Every structure is written in structure tokens, then in C-alpha cells.
Write a protein that binds this ligand. Sequence first.
Ligand code: W43
Ligand code: W43
Lengths: 40, 40, 40, 59, 59, 236, 255, 273, 273, 57
Amino acid sequence: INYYKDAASTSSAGQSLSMDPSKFTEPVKDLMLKGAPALN
Amino acid sequence: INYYKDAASTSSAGQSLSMDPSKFTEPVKDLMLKGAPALN
Amino acid sequence: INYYKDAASTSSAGQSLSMDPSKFTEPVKDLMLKGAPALN
Amino acid sequence: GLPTTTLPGSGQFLTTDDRQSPSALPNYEPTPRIHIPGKVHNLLEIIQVDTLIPMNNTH
Amino acid sequence: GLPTTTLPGSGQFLTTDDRQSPSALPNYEPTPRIHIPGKVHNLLEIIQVDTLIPMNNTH
Amino acid sequence: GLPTTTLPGSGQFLTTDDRQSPSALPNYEPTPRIHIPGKVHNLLEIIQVDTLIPMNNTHTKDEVNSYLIPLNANRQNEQVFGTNLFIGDGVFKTTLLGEIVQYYTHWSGSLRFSLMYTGPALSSAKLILAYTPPGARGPQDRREAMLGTHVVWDIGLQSTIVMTIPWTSGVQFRYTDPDTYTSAGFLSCWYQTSLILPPETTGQVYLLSFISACPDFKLRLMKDTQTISQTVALTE
Amino acid sequence: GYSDRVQQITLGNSTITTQEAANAVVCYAEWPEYLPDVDASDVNKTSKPDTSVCRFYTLDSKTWTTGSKGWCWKLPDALKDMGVFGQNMFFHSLGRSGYTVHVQCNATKFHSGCLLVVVIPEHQLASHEGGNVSVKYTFTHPGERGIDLSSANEVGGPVKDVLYNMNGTLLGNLLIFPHQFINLRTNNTATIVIPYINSVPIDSMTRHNNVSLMVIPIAPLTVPTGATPSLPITVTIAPMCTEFSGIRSKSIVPQ
Amino acid sequence: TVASISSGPKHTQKVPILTANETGATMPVLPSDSIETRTTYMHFNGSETDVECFLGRAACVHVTEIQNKDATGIDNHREAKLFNDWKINLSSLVQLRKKLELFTYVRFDSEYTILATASQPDSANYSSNLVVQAMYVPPGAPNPKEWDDYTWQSASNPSVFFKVGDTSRFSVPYVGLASAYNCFYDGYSHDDAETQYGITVLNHMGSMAFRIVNEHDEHKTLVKIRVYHRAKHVEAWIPRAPRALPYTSIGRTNYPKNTEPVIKKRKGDIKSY
Amino acid sequence: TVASISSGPKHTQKVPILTANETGATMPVLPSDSIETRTTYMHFNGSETDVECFLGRAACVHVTEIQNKDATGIDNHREAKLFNDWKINLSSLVQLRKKLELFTYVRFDSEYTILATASQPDSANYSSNLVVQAMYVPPGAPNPKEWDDYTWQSASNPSVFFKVGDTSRFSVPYVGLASAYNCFYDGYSHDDAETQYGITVLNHMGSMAFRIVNEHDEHKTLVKIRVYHRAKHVEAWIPRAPRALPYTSIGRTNYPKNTEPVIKKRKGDIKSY
Amino acid sequence: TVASISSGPKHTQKVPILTANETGATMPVLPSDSIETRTTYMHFNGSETDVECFLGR
Ligand SMILES: Cc1cc(CCCCCCCOc2ccc(C3=N[C@@H](C)CO3)cc2Cl)on1
Ligand SMILES: Cc1cc(CCCCCCCOc2ccc(C3=N[C@@H](C)CO3)cc2Cl)on1
């Protein structure tokens, strides 16, 4: 129950439960498959 | 939920969301169209 | 009504109403019947 | 009796908060509104009317 | 603002009362339980196991 | 008027509680969000990116050189480097992994340790990396080392080798601050055959080493880092 | 027979071929794109010179020697004088751009050495003076010359200490930024595609640089016996999806 | 539920009262196996002997004390009680300890109540109003060194601020590293020849730290902190023999030497009533 | 969810552990790519590492102090701490600062808690009860000049009145001018040759102003204000390398000269354990 | 809501920017009547300028 009118006044947000490290761990242009050779 | 009986005791009103500047910006008797000459 | 998000914050648990002393009072491998001889 | 807990901020007066209050004048009947030309609802309505600029500020 | 009245006993700490509290560690995940033989649920379960009586108390 | 009773804890301020508050700026409209690449949602997303380990810690002032593990041509049987696995201390401590682990009290999971070789292309080498699970001492010679988790690495076209320290543990969580009961083992590396340089070439070659966490990883019970402190408030 | 290894990038009227690449990085896995209306604020129609600005400019070459500490360029600064890109830059009030960065360094199978090529969004430098000394404008706008981390401290300039990234963080952790290594034994180029990253939809190109490109030797250069002890490093950069807005008189900037 | 059924005379070949205790069982013999009984009902459920109930009331687990005074010229705040600390545990005061050690492994959430009262043992014009700040410092986290260190910023560490005279209350999930807390541990932290033995080695969750936020007034004020602990969501495994001798140390089973006989000697014979 | 799958011996032409780090990727290698594993489940979600959780607890961001005393003959109230002020920001005290600067741009609503405690360092008959008034003064709004100026009327500016010893709490929406707050800014406010560099130039939202509403009693009373800040509704973009050296200034990245080596030197060899 | 619509070159007999202020009106002229604009949205309602808000603290 929100007792207040504005959105800033609500409690903390709830877990992204998004999670996708590939923008950080695999930003390569041509896709690399694990097990296939790195450099062909 | 109002806890009180009288109307003065309720919280602030809620946004007019009315908004019509023409009583102030265009109080002319004969309607002016933008693009048409001001004085004919 | 829980007012809080985490489970640790809820009140005491509610009675097991489990109760089974046999793991402590009769942990014998071959079942003993009351009334039958203890050692055959 | 329902169990409660009070949070930080209890008793504060924030000039910008918006809550209900008891009316000091229970049951009083305000004067009827009559019609008056000119009602303003938003300050955005009025800043669209143009006004003169003292551009020649040099005095 | 909803009108309230506090009763006698407000603010007391009764070591035997059972209510909710804020968690100091929001969102923490406890270690999984694994199975352990021997769980006790009632003290009534254990007082049915017999134990020896020092009957010969005369020492 | 509804009857109430207040409980113990009324009026307290717990920095970790999460409740509603009146907005000081009623009705204000925040700037629209635009799109920005790079959004982070979990610290677990970022500790999977690998970063360099200053393994060569033996210097006396911080230098680019403590990131370089040297290799000697023609040595046989010998040991390249050694370290314990207290990820919250020692070599690990300044790495991104080490640095985040320090915001939490407990960690569990697998680690990924990789070595990238930088020697001339016409050289060759075979190294063994060994993980020694808790309970034994840091290995003292390859024979000892090779009886635990190990990978023979053959230096080739493929420049890096990724060793995983699989989670070996009784207790399901360990302390990030070094603790005995909770300790994780040792990591050592030895020549399997030996580094060989081509003609017209000389000196030391170096390995770069990285650390990142496997998707396996768990961190819990947040706390304050020993990695930052202060004596007076800063000003502009 | 496609290898990760050979590549061709054609952009505008200019083409680059590498026969010894190591894939390419696209920052944060996003490719440069123009500014959508839903994200727009300024009401001005923007100008998109296209092929006259989105081509490859090769900056002047650097020389890696055994004593090198590393070099740093800022964008869009490094290009402030390249062809029509630069003119547009000084002439509009606002502009926006992504880039393809191609760093080149070839050697032989007897050399060793490894450079880190990294792009840092919003790289605010530190004053070597400490305290709250600022870093003057000119110092953070080196132009095509970039900053040479093995040059001496100057007054009003930034600190040039490599183990600290010019800001109080350790060299070892730069790997959290989009980056690629050039390891003579593997690699001979590094290519990074940079999407436009800012907290506003379009900004000024002269008062704010939005990325620093940094090339840092990490495993020292080691040449074969009696080889000359140095290699040149060349940086070629191409603006991509550039848009300029708010045209007028032509900015005048310090120094 | 019947507590006793009706049972009458017996002349059988089936004797439920003869058993062999050597087997380790306690055969479930009832009054009706050996006398003639009448029906009676239980009227009772055994509610208040549930382990949740047994371990579920607040017990005092710790009393410490800190003072508010001018720290000017104090070389060791910790030592002046300018802010004490408590290496957390639940077995310093013994009432609750004997209760928990009836079990080998125990798992529960904790609810802490902290009462703080002030004393002004020497001449003061008044009673000041002090705010206590008690923050949780886990293992591998700076401990405060002065009563006003950067540590107290506690940007990542849960801390509660309440007033002396009041009470603070919050609840912490089960923070054990394993599946249960050990009540006992017949091991070491490693195979060292001189390492400590027992449970002080598993049992560790760093210490709780208290201080007064107020600067000093002209008089000195003693604030004494009492921490109460209530187990909620209890789970207990493997019952053990109750503690008979007195305790000597947190975490070891050791009893004092030349202790006294714990079994009451008869005033009379074995035959005495 | 499985944390590890079962995997057995391998003798392949498909080697997942050989990679080329020069590419910039961190290949997702697992224990099961290089040893034989057994199935195990995660039992965990990664809840407490969510950025909302990481930045979502209150951190102390500012400690200031004001006093209640006779202003008679004071030529500069501001200077007598008759009512101080704080040029708002979140990076004076550093615990929270290092946490935020793990990201480049950050967007969130703020919840402020303000604790005020009083001190009476020299002889008083009693402790008075003071009401604090802390009002928000944005840029382009009169700052108060005396402790009782027309400014304090605060007819259009949000202000909260609470009692010393108590706490005040309210929450302010994200007031940034852009889409996110910059954590870093490699720019200037204009192309000036001598203008300041860094983020002190974007970062500005004027200052918060505190005063006691009470007139003076016979003694003097020191009131010390602590502002706590909790981020709610957090959004963070572009992770960066953590801060290694100490901080010297609000808003610049500058570190101190002749700082100490931040990487711990080995006591022994590279080969040492 | 659009804050500005897209508008391009103009060569007309219809001039919205010439008016006669003597009339007392403020003619509703927009950026798009005199420069070439691109579409942009308002993203804003004018909530905090409502007179209830202005006089309500
Ligand atoms: C503010 C603030 C302060 C705190 C502290 C949270 C609680 C930390 C301590 C965790 C609970 O610790 C124990 C639990 C069980 C046992 C235990 N000992 C054995 C006999 C059995 O159980 C011992 C401890 Cl120290 O959190 N927020
Ligand atoms: C009464 C009363 C008092 C107030 C004050 C409301 C809050 C005003 C300040 C707004 C929040 O300011 C910031 C938010 C973020 C950052 C920030 N700095 C960077 C590292 C990142 O974010 C800095 C500030 Cl000052 O409102 N009503």
C-alpha cells in the first residue's frame, strides 16, 4: 500500500533479476564459441 | 480514505489539468488565424 | 499480515505438532513388539 | 489494541507534506461560489502572455 | 493521517511476546539445509527415552 | 480513534530498513531517461569480467612489473610462481574480484584463473598449473603438485589457458577475510618441459595472469571494505 | 576460409585491411546509431554529413621503445582538426558521434611485447599536485598529439603515472573497460567500435570529451638481437553516425 | 485423545512388562499394562514444550557498558569505554546456554532487543539525552578505532541509532556458514599441533560495536547496554545429556577443578524415604 | 538451477580451455570443462548483490554543527555557527563515495534521515529542548544571512522542523538536470582557459541550511547534525575500476603525492605461498 | 505529446511570424514557424505549476 502520492516516496525497488554479463564479458563483434578455436 | 467528516479537512486537491491560456493570450473579439494577415 | 519483506522478520513459527519419539526410544534394527519376548 | 512501531520522522513537520486534519469549524457552510471571469489554473497559462522587456536598461 | 490512541503497555518489552521486526540484513540468502538424522520437535519426545537414576545416593 | 500499542524498537533508525517517506518536492517531474549503453544490474555481472593479478608482488613500490610473471629459457622441473587462495587478501586483493569480494562477508563458487603467454611466436613451452585443495601444504615440487587439480598447458597459437579452481569444500561458504577453517588451498605453476627461445632471441619472457569468477559464484552478507578510509571530511 | 584474423572495414572513401586481427570489440555490445526522436530534446533538425565526416583519419605515429610508458588520446579532441569533421565540430553548438578505432603495430615472430588498447568512458584525469588543483583545459585537449605518459609533469597538467590510470585506480583493472590486447606473437591490430555514451542526448564537442583511448605497453617490447630497439604504433580513427546541431558562428577555444 | 483406556484383569502368556534394556530401546509401557485402568482423556497437546516455544523467548545474552565523556587527551578510546565492543556469541551468560546445549546442531533466525539505561554516579545538573549507535562489524571489516572514526559512517554495514532509556529491535536471518550452528564441535580449524580445539573456531561472526553519538556535556554519563536474544524459526537436531557441572569458558566444555558433588547425598540409607 | 552438471572423462579435438585473451572477451569456462564433476544445485539467487541493494542502505554523508546562543552582538551568524549550511553533495565522507564510483552514471531517488543530538560542554542547569529547522535552498534563491532572516519563512522552499534527539526523514525525487548524475565528467563548463575541470561544475543543487528555532537560554547548547542518505530506485551504467588511492577533494579524481604502494609486497618470493 | 513537430523549408505567402501586437493578443508562434525542426516529445505535464501546488505548501 503506498500512503503517499509521489513515486519517489515508495520503498526500495525489488530485484532486477535481470543479469546479463555478456555486454561486459563478451563484447566481441564476431561470436566466439567455447571449444572452437579462438583464432581461425 | 477520509478520516474526517468535513471537506476542509481533506488533503490538497489534485491537478487541474485544465490549462487554457486563450482567455489571457487571445481575448480578441474577431478570431485571428496564425499565418493570415493580422490586419486586413 | 507480514509487514516486512524478508522471512527472518516474521514472528515465531507455530507448533511442529510433529512428535515421533521412536527415533530416540526404539532405534532397534529388528522391530520389537510389546508383549512378545524381548530376546527369542 | 493493535501493535504498532513508529519510524524515523515521526513528529516532524515538513512544510510540503499533504495530509488530513480535523476541521476547527465542524459543520460550517462556506459561501456559494458565483462565476468570476479569469480563472487561472497553471502558472504555465500566464507565462504565455507577452509583456514588455526594459531592454534599454542604460538609465 | 488516521487518528489513534495508545494503550497502557505501549513501549514495554515483554521477553515472551512474538512480533515482526525489520531484518538488519535485507536480502541475504541463508545456507541451504541438508538432511541431519535426529531432529527433535518436542521436549515430550525426549523425556520418553529412559536414563539411569543414581538411586544409591549414599556416597 | 483506533486503539494501538507501540512495540520495542519504536523510534529507532536502522540504516537497512526500507519504508515509505513523504516527498519533499511534491509533484516534481524528473528528467526523462534516455538510453545509455552499459547498464549494470548485479555485482555478479561484473565479477565475471577478468582483470590482471599483480602476481609478481615482490617489488617495493607499485609498478607495471608486478603484473609480469617472468619465465626463464631452458630451466627444467622448476617452479614458476605460487600463491595461496585468500581471494580477499594478498595478490587478489586489488583485482576487481578481490575488490568486490571485500564488500561481502562470505563467498562460495568456482574461480577462473587464466595465463596469457607473451613470448616470441617462434618459442615454445609446456607449463603445468596445479590447484591444491585445502588440507595439504603448498606443493614443494611438481611431483607433489601434479597429484591435485592441474592442467598441462601447451603454448601455441592459442595464447591463453583458462584454469578453473573448482569449488572444493566441506562447508558451503568461506570467509572473504582470510580464515583458517575456511581456507581454500594453493595455486602453483611449474615447467612441464621448459621454455625454449628461437635463435637471435634472448632473455626473459612474461606471462600475464587474470582472475574472474565462474557463473557458480555466490557472495553474501554485505559489509564495509577495509580498502578505503579517511581522517577528515573532504571539501571542494 | 574466413578467419577472425583477416578483416576489411570500409567507411566512406577509406578502407583498412588487417591480415592479423583478434576479432573486434563493440563497446557494451552496442553499435553506433543516430539519435532517436524519443530521446531528443533540442528542437533543431541535425546535420549528417555522412561520408565526408565518417571516414578514417590516421593520427601521427608514436614510437614504442623499451622505455615507453603509454599514450592517451581524448575523443572528439584527437580529431578536432581532421578535414570536415573538425570544421563541423567548431561550427555547431552541439554534435554527437560513435567511432571505429583501429590501433596498428606489426613486428616479426622474434619480437615480444604486448600493448593494452582500452576505451574509458568519461576519463576525468587527476592533477599531480593533489588536493583540489584542477587540470587546465589545454592539458586535457592535446589534439592529435595525445598525452605521453612518459613526458614530465607540467603545471596545470594531469598526473602521468601509469599504475594509476591517471585517476587513482589500478592499471590491472582497466580490463573492466572495452579493450583488446596487441600481443606481437598473436595480433598486429586492435579494433574497437564505440557507440555514443553520455547522460545527455547530444552535448558540446569542445567542452567535454567523452572517451579517452589509451594504448599502454604492459609486457615490454623485446626485439631480436641487434634489431633496432623500437616499433612505431599508428592510431587510425573514424567518426561514425556523426550528427551536428545548432549551427552558428564558430567556437573560439583556449590556446 | 485418550490418556488411558479402560483395561481389566489379565492372566496371559503375553507379558508386556518384561523386557531386555540391553537392546537400547525404551519399550512403550503404559499404566494399563500392569494395573486395571478406566478411560480418561488427555485434554492437552504439548504445545509449550515445542522447541520453537522452548527457545523462543528473549534471554539476556550480554551486558556491556560505554561512557560519554570528554575524549580530549584519551589515547585509547576503546580502553576508556568511549565506545565498547562485543565479540558476538551466545554463551557468556549461562541460562540460555544450558537450554541450547540440550541439542548438538541448532538453526534459527535471531531477534535482538537492546535496552540501554543511563547512570550518573557523580554529581550532574541533569540527565542528558544520548543516542546510542550500535553497528555490526563482520570479519574483514575495519573496526573502529576511535569513537568517531570513518568506520561509524557504516555505509555498507547495518547500524541502528536509538535513545538511551529506549530499546532497539531488529532481527537477523540465520547467518551460519553451514546448514546449522554447531553447539559442539570435536575438531580443529586445521591439523595444527597447537591450534585451539572446540567451537570458538567455527563460531565466529565478528563483533557488535556500540558508542554514544553525543559529544560530551560537563558531567560524565555511564550507559550500560543489555542485549537480549530470541530464537525464531527454530530447528534442533540430536539431543544430548544436560549440563551438570558449572561452565568456565565460552566455547569449551571444560568444568572447574575440585567442583562439588552434583548428585545430592541421601540423609539416610538407600532404604530411606 | 544447476551449479555444476555431471561430466566425465574427455579426449577431444574440442578444447574449451584454450582461448585468446587478446580479443577482449572472458570466455565462460566452468569446472566441468576441465575436471570430472557431479551435479550440484545453486540454492542461491544473487539477491543481495543487486545494485538496488548495494546502494540502498543509509550511509552517513555529512556531519555539521550549529549552536544556540545569544546572538546579541554577533556580526556574522554564519560564522558563529548560529545556523550553519552545507553545499550539498555526497562525497565528503568516503565509504559511500567509493561504492558509487564503481559506476559512471547513476540515477536514483534519495531518502534523507537527519539525526540531531545536543551537547552541553560547559555547566548548564539543564538540557533545553530545541527544535531544528533544516530548509533546502536551491541555486538562485536567497540564502539566509542571519539565523532569523525572512529567508526562514520558506514560503516556497521545502523545510522540515524536528526536535534535537529525534530524527527527520523525507525523500527527494531524482533532481538531476540530465538523465543520470555523472559520477565522473571529463569536461569543463565552457571552453575557458582557466575554468575548473571535473564534476563540481555539473554537480550542483545548492545547499541545505540548518538552524535552531529556539531563542537562547542562559547556557550554550551545541547541536551536531548528521545527514544519512539512502538511494532508492537505483539505475547504474558503465562499471569502472574501483578506487585504489585515497581521495583528496570533493569532485576531483586527484590522489595525494608520495602516497604508499597500494599492492602488498610479498614476504618472500614470487614462489612463496 | 509532441513538443516540436518536424518541419522543413518554407517559401510561402502565409507568414505566421508577422503580427500586430496592438490587438492585445499573444499569437501562438512556435520554433517550427521560423526554423526547420525535428520531432521531440514533451515528457512533462506541468504538474508543479498548478496553482494548488504553488499555494499549497
Ligand atoms: C544494527 C545491527 C546489528 C546487527 C547484528 C546482527 C546479528 C549478528 C550475529 C549473528 C547471530 O550469531 C549467532 C547465532 C547462533 C549462535 C550459536 N552458538 C551456539 C551454542 C549455538 O548457536 C551464536 C551466534 Cl554468535 O545487525 N544489525
Ligand atoms: C526540507 C528538505 C530538505 C531537502 C533536500 C532535498 C535533497 C536535495 C539534494 C538532491 C540530491 O543531490 C545529489 C544526488 C546525487 C549526487 C551524486 N554525486 C555523484 C557521485 C553521484 O550522485 C549528488 C547530489 Cl548532491 O528537501 N526538503
